[PDB]
RNA sequence: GGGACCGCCAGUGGCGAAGGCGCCCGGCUGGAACGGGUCCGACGGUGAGCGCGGAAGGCCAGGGGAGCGAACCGGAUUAGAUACCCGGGUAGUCCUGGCUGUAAAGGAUGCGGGCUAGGUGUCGGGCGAGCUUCGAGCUCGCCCGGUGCCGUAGGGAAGCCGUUAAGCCCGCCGCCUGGGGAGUACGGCCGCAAGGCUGAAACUUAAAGGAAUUGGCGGGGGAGCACUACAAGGGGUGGAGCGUGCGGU
């Protein structure tokens, strides 16, 4: 690690927001280097406890902290969700996560739409209504 | 982790004839030379101007380091979801053009261009503007060089002009460059 | 209901050309 | 008018001249005008292609209030005028046309296989023609001896 | 690298006889509104039969196969699941050649014409303007056709319908005459099969059906109060013995 001229290093943090769990990465800006990666699971196991904010708030948060280390102090944030046959909209960790970085100190100065939204078409599963319950 | 980080060597972009130069941007790698295809996004922090305000991204690919100092070429331009979703209208119609350019420097460049029609009609004066958009894009790309036109293209000048000699077919609005996407780079390295 | 009387009707159908099939 | 037969729509409100008194706003003879109908004729024009000239050029309402009767043909105008000539054949232009369409159709439907909307055209083209036809022949427009089947049709195209 | 499809565009929007038809570019090609009736001169309307097209899936061959997913194999839910739910997964979905023919294939409104109050929007054409970025770009009216909303005379059981008639007339075709048995049986006919077309009777019944009115009801929607409601909070019954009443004995 020496040519470093920028100056102040900037991260693209990564957000993929399942309902079935959330998962927060950090890498630069080039994407070559993962600094953090922490999900809900690793913070707690519980299986309920996994997409809930709270538990998303706390992981991105430690994140956060190796990213103050760094020198990464602004963030561009990237939120997608799953999408192959499942829901397109992103989980509840989305909200939380940006709410972990700007009580965390690092400031957003792009949001960014790199969700899986197809131009070609996927089909979710159902049951020819839908999930039920 | 997994490093001091001293075994991961980071690198740092520059662009000469392209912008000149830049002092943003780094690449960390583990090894030299797997920083030689990694695609790099910047807003640009050299500038504050357009680039960064109405055209928000580009790409920049470094296709080659030398001496731990990164030589690089332009990979892409593109807006953002944001952009067009809002632009668009209902009781209107969206025109879009495709060219693929041959420019005289030996790099094959691609454009997506965005216009947006005035109002009702829907009439064949549409694909007739077509016809135009892609032939005034010709003539612009064609007499400049690579570090000329992509300053052009990638700023409102293009677009306000494209506007203006379509305006007298059939009025337009909105008018943008959704994305440029660089077919082919080299022409002077393999 | 609806489903009931057509499928039964198809199942009547099949066993009578059963019965017709191998009692000739 | 209004009538339906391979439209979901209505026909056009157009209506023929009222100028039923004869023309004097024109500054041309009847004699002059069937001159120019003889050139126009034998240049390459077609019967209804003649008539539309006439209405522009020589300024008249309708070709059926300048120059009816001359000839003590039904309803005379122009190709009645050409018949007695020898300009014009028997088998009236309408039908002419119908049939030079018709065959140009299964040309098409042979080079550019899987046509649908193409084909039902070209059996509702070919059927209309039979129902002309018959009344046709009977009026001695056609000779009584004709029929209209798809390879004469090609006969008279060629 | 590969297959598949085209979010935005996309609109109460446009095209086609109908089934139906949506990436963008070019060629080839069918149909339509319209203005100008230029042309034949009653050639017209309807139409039993006949003929033809016919979504999806299916059947047959070949190819293609990324994702999706009858069958299927687990897991949960559930008393058990036979089901909703989850993990895998095959035909198939895709393409071409071939074959069969169904639909709540709906406007549940047969086809052709004349005629019977209007108003507004919208698509394309004709026409006269205003605005103009000088392009029908934005708009208005007359006029012609089409799709929508509101509504007259009238009609309808009513809901509604009302120049797009379920209005007033005429010509022709198709079809019905309580419910179940039964769209079955039997025969013939078509289809490769699945099926399709035609199509009974014995017997049994005092109802079957349509619209609206009112009421109850709804793990249907919205809103609001209650201390004989719930929460908070305090005591108590169910334990034991006794007193008292009842079932049983």
């Given at each position: 690690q020496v040519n470093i001229k920028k100056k102040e290093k900037w991260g693209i943090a990564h957000i993929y927001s399942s309902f079935n769990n959330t998962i927060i990465h950090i890498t630069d800006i080039t994407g070559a280097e993962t600094i953090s990666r922490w999900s809900g699971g690793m913070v707690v196991k519980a299986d309920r406890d996994e997409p809930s904010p709270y538990a998303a708030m706390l992981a991105a948060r430690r994140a956060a902290e190796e990213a103050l280390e760094k020198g990464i102090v602004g963030v561009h944030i990237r939120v997608r969700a799953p999408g192959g046959s499942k829901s397109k909209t992103p989980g509840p960790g989305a909200q939380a996560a940006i709410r972990a970085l700007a009580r965390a100190g690092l400031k957003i100065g792009r949001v960014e739409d790199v969700t899986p939204?197809?131009?070609?078409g996927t089909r979710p599963k159902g049951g020819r209504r839908g999930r039920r319950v | 982790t997994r490093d001091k980080w001293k075994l991961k060597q980071w690198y740092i972009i520059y662009a000469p004839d392209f912008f000149g130069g830049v002092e943003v941007g780094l690449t960390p790698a583990d090894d030299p030379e797997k920083v030689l295809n990694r695609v790099v996004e910047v807003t640009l922090k050299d500038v504050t101007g357009d680039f960064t305000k109405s055209h928000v991204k580009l790409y920049f690919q470094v296709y080659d380091v030398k001496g731990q100092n990164a030589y690089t070429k332009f990979k892409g331009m593109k807006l953002a979801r944001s952009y067009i979703r809002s632009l668009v209208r209902r009781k209107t119609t969206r025109i879009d053009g495709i060219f693929n350019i041959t420019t005289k420097d030996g790099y094959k460049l691609r454009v997506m261009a965005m216009a947006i029609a005035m109002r009702r009609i829907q009439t064949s004066q549409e694909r007739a503007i077509r016809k135009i958009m892609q032939e005034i894009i010709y003539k612009k790309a064609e007499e400049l060089n690579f570090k000329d036109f992509v300053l052009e293209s990638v700023n409102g000048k293009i677009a306000a002009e494209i506007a203006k000699e379509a305006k007298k077919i059939y009025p337009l609005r909105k008018?943008?460059?959704?994305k440029i996407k660089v077919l082919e780079e080299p022409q002077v390295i393999a | 209901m609806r489903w009931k009387w057509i499928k039964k009707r198809i199942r009547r159908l099949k066993r009578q050309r059963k019965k017709e099939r191998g009692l000739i | 008018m209004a009538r339906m037969h391979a439209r979901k729509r209505g026909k056009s409100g157009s209506k023929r001249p009222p100028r039923t008194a004869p023309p004097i706003w024109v500054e041309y003879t009847v004699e002059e005008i069937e001159n120019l109908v003889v050139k126009l004729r034998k240049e390459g024009y077609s019967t209804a292609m003649i008539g539309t000239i006439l209405r522009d050029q020589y300024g008249i309402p309708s070709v059926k209030l300048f120059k009816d009767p001359d000839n003590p043909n039904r309803n005379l105008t122009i190709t009645r005028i050409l018949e007695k000539h020898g300009?014009?054949?028997?088998?009236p232009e309408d039908l002419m046309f119908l049939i030079r369409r018709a065959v140009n159709l299964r040309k098409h439907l042979e080079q550019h296989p899987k046509d649908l909307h193409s084909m039902r055209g070209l059996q509702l083209i070919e059927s209309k023609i039979r129902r002309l036809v018959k009344y046709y022949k009977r009026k001695g427009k056609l000779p009584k001896n004709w029929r209209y089947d798809p390879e004469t049709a090609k006969l008279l195209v060629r």
């Open positions: 939204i197809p131009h070609d | 008018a943008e460059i959704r | - | 300009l014009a054949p028997e088998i």
